[PDB]
Structure formats: structure tokens, C-alpha cells
Amino acid sequence: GLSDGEWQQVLNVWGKVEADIAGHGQEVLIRLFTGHPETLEKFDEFKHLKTEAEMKASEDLKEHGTVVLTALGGILKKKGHHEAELKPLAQSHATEHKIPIKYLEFISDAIIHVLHSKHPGDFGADAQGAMTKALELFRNDIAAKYKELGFQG
Ligand code: HEM
């Protein structure tokens, strides 16, 4: 439900993330976990890293942030034709990891935050509108799969 000009926007600003996906993904994860400590509890391997400084000191956490943003970038480059990518994600997060949909809301907000934090003055208002629509589309399509499963919610 984005226009082509909106998708262009999304994928242009995503180039800034690709310049250093690990650093971006670490920062996303930290924003999520520090703003919403209940999210950290879902990660058995990270749940002992309760503070920003502890999180930052883990290459394992940074590599998971790398996994997360690489997955999301591949989905964004499908410009909404992402059923096959998003299916397994929704299903593992509902059924295996037990992630309520509001945690996808929190990580979408965290991405917007981290874009402005790392690129102050370079994440323009048109780009924030288009990225926000792309994250909404992502989490909306995951929410429809959660609803099939009856998970949550
Ligand atoms: C942009 C949104 C997200 C993306 C693209 C994403 C992607 C991934 C990927 C690729 C994996 C590994 C494969 C899999 O198990 O499906 C994974 C695992 C996992 N995700 Fe997510 N994730 C997202 C959001 C979240 C959120 C919001 C949480 C909770 C706050 C979460 C919790 C987990 C957990 C607990 C695992 C298993 C980690 C482990 O023990 O190795 N995810 N995620």
C-alpha cells in the first residue's frame, strides 16, 4: 500500500542502514530492550544483559541485530510482495518465540528512533512517512498471521 515514490524513499534511506547494518541493528535492539525490558526476557541468551552498557559489550547481541535488520531489508526490497518472507517470521515469532504483536510495534518505533539518532537532520519528513508506512505494512501482515494462529491477542 505504498506508492512507488514511497517505496523509493524507503529503500533510499535503507542505504544508510546498509552502510553499517551491525551498528544500526545493535542500536535498534538496545532501544527496544532498554525502553521495554519485557522484550529482553524473551531472549534466553541475552536476558542477563539488562543494561545498555552490558548489551553493547556483546558481539552475540550485535550479530542478532545484524540478523534482524538483514531480514527486514530483504523484506523491504520486496516492496510489499513479501508473503513468503513474512510467513515464517510471523509463525516463528508467535509460536516458537512467543512475541506479542505489540513488541513488533515497539521495534518499529525503535527503528524510527534509531534512524533519527544516527542520522540527525538526514532522515527527512517524506522519508519518515514512507518508512513508517513500510513498517506498518510489515507488522500488519504479521498481525494477520497472528490472527490466523489465535496468538495473543
Ligand atoms: C523487525 C522485526 C524483526 C525481525 C525482522 C526479526 C527477525 C528474526 C530472525 C530472522 C530470527 C531468527 C529466525 C527465526 O527464529 O525466525 C529471529 C529470532 C528471534 N526473535 Fe526476532 N525479529 C523481529 C522482531 C522481534 C521482536 C520485536 C522480538 C521480541 C522483542 C523478537 C524476538 C526474537 C527471539 C526471542 C528470537 C530467537 C532468538 C534466539 O534465541 O536465537 N523478534 N528474529
Short mmCIF file of N, CA and C and ligand atoms in Angstrom, two decimals:
data_model
loop_
_atom_site.label_atom_id
_atom_site.label_comp_id
_atom_site.label_asym_id
_atom_site.label_seq_id
_atom_site.Cartn_x
_atom_site.Cartn_y
_atom_site.Cartn_z
N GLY A 1 0.78 -1.28 0.00
CA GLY A 1 0.00 0.00 0.00
C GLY A 1 0.80 1.30 0.00
N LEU A 2 2.08 1.17 -0.35
CA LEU A 2 2.89 2.36 -0.62
C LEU A 2 2.90 2.62 -2.10
N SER A 3 3.01 3.87 -2.48
CA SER A 3 3.27 4.19 -3.85
C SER A 3 4.68 3.87 -4.26
N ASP A 4 5.02 3.91 -5.55
CA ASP A 4 6.42 3.68 -5.94
C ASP A 4 7.31 4.79 -5.41
N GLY A 5 6.84 6.01 -5.32
CA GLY A 5 7.71 7.04 -4.84
C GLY A 5 8.01 6.85 -3.35
N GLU A 6 7.03 6.36 -2.61
CA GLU A 6 7.22 6.00 -1.17
C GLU A 6 8.18 4.85 -1.02
N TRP A 7 8.02 3.79 -1.78
CA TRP A 7 9.00 2.69 -1.71
C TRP A 7 10.39 3.20 -2.06
N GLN A 8 10.52 4.13 -3.01
CA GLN A 8 11.84 4.64 -3.36
C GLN A 8 12.44 5.33 -2.15
N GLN A 9 11.61 6.09 -1.46
CA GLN A 9 12.04 6.72 -0.29
C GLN A 9 12.58 5.72 0.73
N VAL A 10 11.77 4.73 1.03
CA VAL A 10 12.15 3.68 1.99
C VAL A 10 13.52 3.12 1.63
N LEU A 11 13.69 2.71 0.39
CA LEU A 11 14.88 1.98 0.00
C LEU A 11 16.07 2.91 -0.13
N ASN A 12 15.86 4.21 -0.29
CA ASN A 12 16.93 5.17 -0.25
C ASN A 12 17.43 5.35 1.15
N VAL A 13 16.54 5.58 2.11
CA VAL A 13 17.04 5.72 3.43
C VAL A 13 17.63 4.41 3.97
N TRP A 14 17.17 3.23 3.49
CA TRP A 14 17.72 1.94 3.94
C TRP A 14 19.18 1.90 3.54
N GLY A 15 19.63 2.55 2.48
CA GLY A 15 21.08 2.59 2.15
C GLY A 15 21.89 3.12 3.29
N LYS A 16 21.40 4.03 4.06
CA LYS A 16 22.11 4.49 5.25
C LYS A 16 22.28 3.48 6.31
N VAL A 17 21.30 2.59 6.41
CA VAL A 17 21.38 1.47 7.32
C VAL A 17 22.44 0.43 6.80
N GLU A 18 22.45 0.17 5.50
CA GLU A 18 23.42 -0.74 4.94
C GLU A 18 24.84 -0.30 5.06
N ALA A 19 25.08 0.97 5.21
CA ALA A 19 26.45 1.42 5.43
C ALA A 19 27.05 0.75 6.65
N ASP A 20 26.22 0.38 7.65
CA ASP A 20 26.68 -0.35 8.84
C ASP A 20 25.49 -1.05 9.45
N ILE A 21 25.11 -2.18 8.95
CA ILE A 21 23.87 -2.77 9.50
C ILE A 21 24.11 -3.20 10.93
N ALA A 22 25.30 -3.72 11.27
CA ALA A 22 25.52 -4.20 12.64
C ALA A 22 25.36 -3.10 13.64
N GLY A 23 25.92 -1.94 13.40
CA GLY A 23 25.80 -0.83 14.30
C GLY A 23 24.35 -0.38 14.43
N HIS A 24 23.64 -0.28 13.30
CA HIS A 24 22.21 0.05 13.36
C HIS A 24 21.45 -1.01 14.12
N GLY A 25 21.72 -2.27 13.86
CA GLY A 25 20.91 -3.33 14.46
C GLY A 25 21.16 -3.42 15.92
N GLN A 26 22.42 -3.26 16.36
CA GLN A 26 22.70 -3.18 17.77
C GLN A 26 21.89 -2.10 18.41
N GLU A 27 21.89 -0.88 17.83
CA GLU A 27 21.22 0.20 18.41
C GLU A 27 19.66 0.02 18.45
N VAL A 28 19.14 -0.59 17.46
CA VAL A 28 17.71 -0.93 17.44
C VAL A 28 17.41 -1.84 18.62
N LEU A 29 18.14 -2.97 18.65
CA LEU A 29 17.96 -3.93 19.75
C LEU A 29 18.07 -3.26 21.13
N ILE A 30 19.08 -2.36 21.37
CA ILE A 30 19.29 -1.70 22.64
C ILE A 30 18.08 -0.77 22.96
N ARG A 31 17.63 0.01 21.94
CA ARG A 31 16.50 0.83 22.14
C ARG A 31 15.26 0.02 22.56
N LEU A 32 15.05 -1.08 21.92
CA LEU A 32 13.93 -1.97 22.22
C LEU A 32 14.04 -2.48 23.67
N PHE A 33 15.21 -3.06 24.02
CA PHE A 33 15.41 -3.79 25.25
C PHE A 33 15.42 -2.79 26.42
N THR A 34 15.99 -1.62 26.29
CA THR A 34 16.07 -0.65 27.36
C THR A 34 14.75 0.06 27.53
N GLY A 35 14.07 0.41 26.44
CA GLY A 35 12.73 1.00 26.54
C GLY A 35 11.63 0.06 27.04
N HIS A 36 11.83 -1.21 26.77
CA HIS A 36 10.81 -2.23 27.04
C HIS A 36 11.47 -3.50 27.51
N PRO A 37 11.87 -3.55 28.85
CA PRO A 37 12.63 -4.67 29.36
C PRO A 37 11.95 -5.99 29.28
N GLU A 38 10.60 -6.01 29.14
CA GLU A 38 9.91 -7.29 28.95
C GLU A 38 10.30 -7.97 27.69
N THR A 39 10.78 -7.20 26.69
CA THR A 39 11.21 -7.81 25.40
C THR A 39 12.46 -8.61 25.53
N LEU A 40 13.40 -8.10 26.37
CA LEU A 40 14.69 -8.77 26.61
C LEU A 40 14.52 -10.17 27.22
N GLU A 41 13.45 -10.29 28.06
CA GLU A 41 13.17 -11.54 28.71
C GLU A 41 12.88 -12.67 27.82
N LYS A 42 12.47 -12.35 26.55
CA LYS A 42 12.21 -13.37 25.61
C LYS A 42 13.40 -13.99 24.98
N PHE A 43 14.62 -13.39 25.18
CA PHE A 43 15.83 -13.89 24.59
C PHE A 43 16.61 -14.62 25.66
N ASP A 44 16.55 -15.97 25.68
CA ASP A 44 17.32 -16.71 26.70
C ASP A 44 18.74 -16.41 26.68
N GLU A 45 19.37 -16.03 25.56
CA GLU A 45 20.80 -15.85 25.56
C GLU A 45 21.20 -14.40 25.92
N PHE A 46 20.22 -13.49 25.92
CA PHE A 46 20.55 -12.12 26.23
C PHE A 46 19.94 -11.56 27.50
N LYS A 47 19.14 -12.39 28.17
CA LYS A 47 18.27 -11.87 29.20
C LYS A 47 19.05 -11.39 30.41
N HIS A 48 20.31 -11.79 30.53
CA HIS A 48 21.21 -11.38 31.62
C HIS A 48 21.88 -10.03 31.28
N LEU A 49 21.68 -9.47 30.09
CA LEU A 49 22.27 -8.19 29.68
C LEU A 49 21.28 -7.08 29.89
N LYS A 50 21.00 -6.77 31.16
CA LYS A 50 19.90 -5.88 31.48
C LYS A 50 20.12 -4.43 31.19
N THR A 51 21.33 -3.97 30.99
CA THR A 51 21.62 -2.56 30.77
C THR A 51 22.26 -2.30 29.39
N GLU A 52 22.14 -1.05 28.97
CA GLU A 52 22.72 -0.59 27.73
C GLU A 52 24.18 -1.05 27.60
N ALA A 53 24.96 -0.73 28.63
CA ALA A 53 26.42 -1.00 28.58
C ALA A 53 26.74 -2.48 28.44
N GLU A 54 25.92 -3.30 29.10
CA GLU A 54 26.10 -4.77 29.03
C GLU A 54 25.76 -5.24 27.62
N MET A 55 24.67 -4.74 27.08
CA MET A 55 24.23 -5.08 25.73
C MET A 55 25.30 -4.75 24.68
N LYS A 56 25.86 -3.53 24.87
CA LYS A 56 26.84 -3.03 23.89
C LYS A 56 28.09 -3.87 23.88
N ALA A 57 28.38 -4.60 24.98
CA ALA A 57 29.60 -5.34 25.16
C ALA A 57 29.51 -6.74 24.62
N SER A 58 28.38 -7.09 23.98
CA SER A 58 28.15 -8.45 23.49
C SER A 58 28.19 -8.46 21.99
N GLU A 59 29.16 -9.10 21.38
CA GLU A 59 29.10 -9.30 19.92
C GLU A 59 27.99 -10.22 19.54
N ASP A 60 27.59 -11.16 20.40
CA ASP A 60 26.46 -12.01 20.08
C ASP A 60 25.19 -11.20 19.90
N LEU A 61 24.95 -10.22 20.75
CA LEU A 61 23.78 -9.32 20.59
C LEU A 61 23.87 -8.52 19.32
N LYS A 62 25.06 -8.01 19.02
CA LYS A 62 25.24 -7.25 17.75
C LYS A 62 25.01 -8.14 16.56
N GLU A 63 25.47 -9.37 16.56
CA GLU A 63 25.17 -10.27 15.46
C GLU A 63 23.69 -10.56 15.35
N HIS A 64 22.94 -10.69 16.44
CA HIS A 64 21.49 -10.85 16.29
C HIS A 64 20.89 -9.60 15.69
N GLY A 65 21.35 -8.42 16.05
CA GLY A 65 20.82 -7.22 15.40
C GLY A 65 21.10 -7.20 13.94
N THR A 66 22.21 -7.75 13.56
CA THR A 66 22.60 -7.90 12.13
C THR A 66 21.57 -8.84 11.46
N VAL A 67 21.27 -9.97 12.06
CA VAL A 67 20.28 -10.88 11.53
C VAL A 67 18.93 -10.17 11.37
N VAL A 68 18.54 -9.46 12.38
CA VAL A 68 17.20 -8.81 12.31
C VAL A 68 17.13 -7.82 11.17
N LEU A 69 18.11 -6.90 11.08
CA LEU A 69 17.98 -5.87 10.04
C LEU A 69 18.26 -6.43 8.71
N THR A 70 19.06 -7.47 8.54
CA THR A 70 19.20 -8.08 7.22
C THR A 70 17.90 -8.70 6.81
N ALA A 71 17.20 -9.39 7.68
CA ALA A 71 15.92 -9.97 7.36
C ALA A 71 14.98 -8.88 6.92
N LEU A 72 14.86 -7.79 7.68
CA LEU A 72 13.97 -6.69 7.35
C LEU A 72 14.38 -6.06 6.08
N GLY A 73 15.62 -5.86 5.77
CA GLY A 73 15.99 -5.24 4.50
C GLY A 73 15.58 -6.12 3.35
N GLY A 74 15.71 -7.42 3.40
CA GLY A 74 15.27 -8.26 2.34
C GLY A 74 13.75 -8.16 2.15
N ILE A 75 13.02 -8.07 3.18
CA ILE A 75 11.58 -7.87 3.11
C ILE A 75 11.26 -6.51 2.51
N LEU A 76 11.89 -5.43 2.95
CA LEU A 76 11.60 -4.14 2.37
C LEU A 76 11.84 -4.09 0.87
N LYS A 77 12.84 -4.75 0.41
CA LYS A 77 13.17 -4.74 -1.04
C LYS A 77 12.15 -5.53 -1.83
N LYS A 78 11.26 -6.31 -1.20
CA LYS A 78 10.14 -6.90 -1.92
C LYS A 78 8.99 -5.90 -2.09
N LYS A 79 9.03 -4.72 -1.51
CA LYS A 79 8.03 -3.67 -1.71
C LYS A 79 6.62 -4.20 -1.51
N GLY A 80 6.40 -4.89 -0.39
CA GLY A 80 5.06 -5.38 -0.10
C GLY A 80 4.77 -6.74 -0.67
N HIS A 81 5.47 -7.22 -1.65
CA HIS A 81 5.22 -8.59 -2.19
C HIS A 81 6.05 -9.53 -1.37
N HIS A 82 5.70 -9.65 -0.10
CA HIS A 82 6.60 -10.25 0.88
C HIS A 82 5.95 -11.41 1.60
N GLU A 83 4.84 -11.95 1.12
CA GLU A 83 4.14 -13.06 1.79
C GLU A 83 5.07 -14.21 2.18
N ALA A 84 5.84 -14.68 1.27
CA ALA A 84 6.73 -15.83 1.51
C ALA A 84 7.80 -15.53 2.57
N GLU A 85 8.30 -14.29 2.63
CA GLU A 85 9.27 -13.87 3.68
C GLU A 85 8.70 -13.65 4.95
N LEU A 86 7.48 -13.17 5.03
CA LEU A 86 6.93 -12.75 6.24
C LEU A 86 6.26 -13.90 6.94
N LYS A 87 5.79 -14.91 6.17
CA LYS A 87 5.10 -16.05 6.77
C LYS A 87 5.89 -16.69 7.85
N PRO A 88 7.12 -17.18 7.51
CA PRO A 88 7.87 -17.92 8.51
C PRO A 88 8.21 -17.09 9.75
N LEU A 89 8.43 -15.79 9.50
CA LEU A 89 8.75 -14.86 10.55
C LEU A 89 7.61 -14.80 11.51
N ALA A 90 6.38 -14.55 11.04
CA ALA A 90 5.18 -14.48 11.90
C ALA A 90 5.02 -15.77 12.63
N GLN A 91 5.21 -16.90 11.96
CA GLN A 91 4.92 -18.11 12.63
C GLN A 91 5.96 -18.45 13.76
N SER A 92 7.29 -18.21 13.50
CA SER A 92 8.28 -18.48 14.50
C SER A 92 8.07 -17.53 15.66
N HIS A 93 7.79 -16.23 15.41
CA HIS A 93 7.66 -15.28 16.48
C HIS A 93 6.43 -15.54 17.32
N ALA A 94 5.30 -15.97 16.70
CA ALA A 94 4.10 -16.31 17.53
C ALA A 94 4.28 -17.60 18.27
N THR A 95 4.74 -18.59 17.60
CA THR A 95 4.63 -19.99 18.11
C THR A 95 5.86 -20.45 18.81
N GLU A 96 7.04 -20.19 18.29
CA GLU A 96 8.25 -20.60 18.93
C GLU A 96 8.72 -19.57 19.99
N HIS A 97 8.74 -18.27 19.63
CA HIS A 97 9.36 -17.28 20.50
C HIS A 97 8.39 -16.57 21.43
N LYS A 98 7.10 -16.65 21.10
CA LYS A 98 6.01 -16.10 21.93
C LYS A 98 6.14 -14.58 22.06
N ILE A 99 6.14 -13.94 20.91
CA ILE A 99 6.34 -12.50 20.84
C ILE A 99 5.02 -11.81 20.58
N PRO A 100 4.43 -11.10 21.54
CA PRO A 100 3.17 -10.39 21.24
C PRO A 100 3.34 -9.34 20.15
N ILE A 101 2.28 -9.04 19.39
CA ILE A 101 2.40 -8.11 18.29
C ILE A 101 2.82 -6.75 18.77
N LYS A 102 2.43 -6.31 19.96
CA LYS A 102 2.90 -5.00 20.42
C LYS A 102 4.47 -4.95 20.51
N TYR A 103 5.18 -6.10 20.63
CA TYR A 103 6.63 -5.95 20.65
C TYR A 103 7.09 -5.57 19.23
N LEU A 104 6.40 -6.01 18.17
CA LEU A 104 6.73 -5.54 16.77
C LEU A 104 6.43 -4.05 16.66
N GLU A 105 5.40 -3.57 17.30
CA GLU A 105 5.17 -2.15 17.36
C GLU A 105 6.36 -1.44 18.02
N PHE A 106 6.82 -1.97 19.17
CA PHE A 106 7.95 -1.32 19.84
C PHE A 106 9.20 -1.34 18.97
N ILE A 107 9.47 -2.41 18.25
CA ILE A 107 10.71 -2.41 17.45
C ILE A 107 10.55 -1.51 16.23
N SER A 108 9.31 -1.33 15.73
CA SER A 108 9.13 -0.41 14.58
C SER A 108 9.40 1.01 15.06
N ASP A 109 8.90 1.39 16.21
CA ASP A 109 9.18 2.72 16.80
C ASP A 109 10.70 2.91 17.04
N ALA A 110 11.34 1.82 17.51
CA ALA A 110 12.77 1.86 17.78
C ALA A 110 13.53 2.11 16.46
N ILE A 111 13.15 1.52 15.37
CA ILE A 111 13.84 1.78 14.12
C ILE A 111 13.74 3.24 13.75
N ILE A 112 12.52 3.80 13.83
CA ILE A 112 12.37 5.25 13.53
C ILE A 112 13.29 6.06 14.44
N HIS A 113 13.29 5.75 15.73
CA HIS A 113 14.17 6.47 16.67
C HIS A 113 15.61 6.39 16.27
N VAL A 114 16.07 5.21 15.97
CA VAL A 114 17.48 4.97 15.68
C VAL A 114 17.86 5.66 14.36
N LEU A 115 17.00 5.71 13.36
CA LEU A 115 17.29 6.47 12.15
C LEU A 115 17.54 7.90 12.48
N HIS A 116 16.73 8.54 13.27
CA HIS A 116 16.99 9.95 13.63
C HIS A 116 18.20 10.08 14.53
N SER A 117 18.44 9.12 15.40
CA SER A 117 19.55 9.24 16.33
C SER A 117 20.87 9.13 15.58
N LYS A 118 20.99 8.24 14.63
CA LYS A 118 22.23 8.03 13.89
C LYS A 118 22.40 9.03 12.75
N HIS A 119 21.32 9.62 12.26
CA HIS A 119 21.34 10.49 11.06
C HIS A 119 20.55 11.77 11.35
N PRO A 120 20.81 12.42 12.51
CA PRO A 120 20.03 13.64 12.75
C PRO A 120 20.03 14.69 11.69
N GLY A 121 18.84 15.08 11.25
CA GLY A 121 18.78 16.08 10.15
C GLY A 121 18.89 15.45 8.79
N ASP A 122 19.09 14.14 8.68
CA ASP A 122 19.22 13.49 7.37
C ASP A 122 18.12 12.45 7.15
N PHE A 123 17.12 12.36 8.03
CA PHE A 123 16.01 11.46 7.82
C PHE A 123 14.78 12.35 7.64
N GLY A 124 14.55 12.71 6.37
CA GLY A 124 13.59 13.74 6.06
C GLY A 124 12.17 13.36 6.28
N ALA A 125 11.30 14.39 6.31
CA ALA A 125 9.92 14.12 6.75
C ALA A 125 9.22 13.16 5.76
N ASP A 126 9.50 13.25 4.47
CA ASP A 126 8.93 12.37 3.46
C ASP A 126 9.45 10.96 3.71
N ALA A 127 10.73 10.81 4.02
CA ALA A 127 11.32 9.51 4.30
C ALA A 127 10.74 8.88 5.57
N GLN A 128 10.51 9.67 6.60
CA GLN A 128 9.88 9.08 7.81
C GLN A 128 8.47 8.62 7.50
N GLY A 129 7.69 9.38 6.74
CA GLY A 129 6.32 8.92 6.37
C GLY A 129 6.42 7.61 5.60
N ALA A 130 7.31 7.50 4.63
CA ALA A 130 7.34 6.28 3.83
C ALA A 130 7.85 5.11 4.63
N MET A 131 8.93 5.28 5.42
CA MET A 131 9.42 4.16 6.28
C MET A 131 8.36 3.73 7.27
N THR A 132 7.64 4.67 7.88
CA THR A 132 6.58 4.32 8.83
C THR A 132 5.53 3.50 8.10
N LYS A 133 5.08 3.88 6.94
CA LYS A 133 4.14 3.04 6.21
C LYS A 133 4.66 1.68 5.92
N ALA A 134 5.96 1.52 5.57
CA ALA A 134 6.51 0.22 5.29
C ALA A 134 6.54 -0.63 6.54
N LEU A 135 6.87 -0.04 7.70
CA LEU A 135 6.88 -0.82 8.96
C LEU A 135 5.47 -1.18 9.35
N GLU A 136 4.51 -0.29 9.17
CA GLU A 136 3.13 -0.64 9.42
C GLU A 136 2.70 -1.77 8.57
N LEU A 137 2.98 -1.75 7.29
CA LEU A 137 2.60 -2.83 6.40
C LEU A 137 3.19 -4.12 6.89
N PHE A 138 4.48 -4.18 7.19
CA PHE A 138 5.17 -5.32 7.76
C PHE A 138 4.42 -5.83 8.98
N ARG A 139 4.17 -4.96 9.93
CA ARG A 139 3.64 -5.54 11.19
C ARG A 139 2.14 -5.85 11.00
N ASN A 140 1.41 -5.19 10.14
CA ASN A 140 0.07 -5.53 9.83
C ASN A 140 -0.05 -6.88 9.18
N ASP A 141 0.82 -7.19 8.23
CA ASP A 141 0.78 -8.50 7.63
C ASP A 141 1.18 -9.56 8.56
N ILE A 142 2.10 -9.32 9.48
CA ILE A 142 2.38 -10.27 10.53
C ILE A 142 1.12 -10.37 11.45
N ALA A 143 0.49 -9.31 11.80
CA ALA A 143 -0.69 -9.39 12.67
C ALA A 143 -1.76 -10.27 11.99
N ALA A 144 -1.92 -10.28 10.68
CA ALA A 144 -2.95 -11.11 10.10
C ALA A 144 -2.54 -12.54 10.30
N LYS A 145 -1.29 -12.92 10.21
CA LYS A 145 -0.89 -14.27 10.50
C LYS A 145 -1.04 -14.64 11.98
N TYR A 146 -0.80 -13.71 12.88
CA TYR A 146 -1.01 -13.96 14.28
C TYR A 146 -2.50 -14.25 14.48
N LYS A 147 -3.37 -13.53 13.86
CA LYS A 147 -4.79 -13.78 13.98
C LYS A 147 -5.18 -15.15 13.47
N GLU A 148 -4.63 -15.62 12.36
CA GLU A 148 -4.91 -16.99 11.96
C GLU A 148 -4.60 -17.93 13.11
N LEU A 149 -3.42 -17.77 13.74
CA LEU A 149 -2.96 -18.64 14.79
C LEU A 149 -3.71 -18.45 16.10
N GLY A 150 -4.48 -17.42 16.26
CA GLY A 150 -5.11 -17.08 17.53
C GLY A 150 -4.08 -16.64 18.56
N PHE A 151 -2.92 -16.14 18.11
CA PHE A 151 -1.88 -15.87 19.12
C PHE A 151 -2.02 -14.50 19.63
N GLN A 152 -1.93 -14.46 20.97
CA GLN A 152 -2.17 -13.28 21.83
C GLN A 152 -3.55 -13.31 22.42
N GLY A 153 -4.55 -12.63 21.83
CA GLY A 153 -4.41 -11.32 21.20
C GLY A 153 -5.67 -11.24 20.42
C1 HEM B 1 11.89 -6.17 12.52
C2 HEM B 1 11.34 -7.19 13.33
C3 HEM B 1 12.01 -8.49 13.50
C4 HEM B 1 12.66 -9.23 12.62
C5 HEM B 1 12.89 -8.98 11.12
C6 HEM B 1 13.11 -10.43 13.35
C7 HEM B 1 13.88 -11.40 12.77
C8 HEM B 1 14.34 -12.53 13.43
C9 HEM B 1 15.06 -13.60 12.80
C10 HEM B 1 15.50 -13.66 11.39
C11 HEM B 1 15.28 -14.53 13.78
C12 HEM B 1 15.91 -15.93 13.55
C13 HEM B 1 14.95 -16.88 12.79
C14 HEM B 1 13.62 -17.11 13.45
O1 HEM B 1 13.63 -17.64 14.59
O2 HEM B 1 12.58 -16.77 12.81
C15 HEM B 1 14.67 -14.07 14.99
C16 HEM B 1 14.68 -14.73 16.22
C17 HEM B 1 14.13 -14.28 17.36
N1 HEM B 1 13.40 -13.13 17.52
FE1 HEM B 1 13.01 -11.76 16.09
N2 HEM B 1 12.73 -10.35 14.66
C18 HEM B 1 11.99 -9.20 14.80
C19 HEM B 1 11.42 -8.73 15.94
C20 HEM B 1 11.47 -9.37 17.20
C21 HEM B 1 10.96 -8.80 18.40
C22 HEM B 1 10.26 -7.49 18.48
C23 HEM B 1 11.25 -9.70 19.39
C24 HEM B 1 10.97 -9.51 20.84
C25 HEM B 1 11.02 -8.36 21.48
C26 HEM B 1 11.88 -10.81 18.81
C27 HEM B 1 12.34 -11.98 19.44
C28 HEM B 1 13.02 -13.00 18.87
C29 HEM B 1 13.54 -14.14 19.60
C30 HEM B 1 13.43 -14.42 21.09
C31 HEM B 1 14.23 -14.95 18.66
C32 HEM B 1 15.02 -16.21 18.98
C33 HEM B 1 16.47 -15.78 19.35
C34 HEM B 1 17.38 -16.89 19.81
O3 HEM B 1 17.20 -17.38 20.98
O4 HEM B 1 18.30 -17.25 18.98
N3 HEM B 1 11.99 -10.57 17.44
N4 HEM B 1 14.11 -12.86 14.73
#
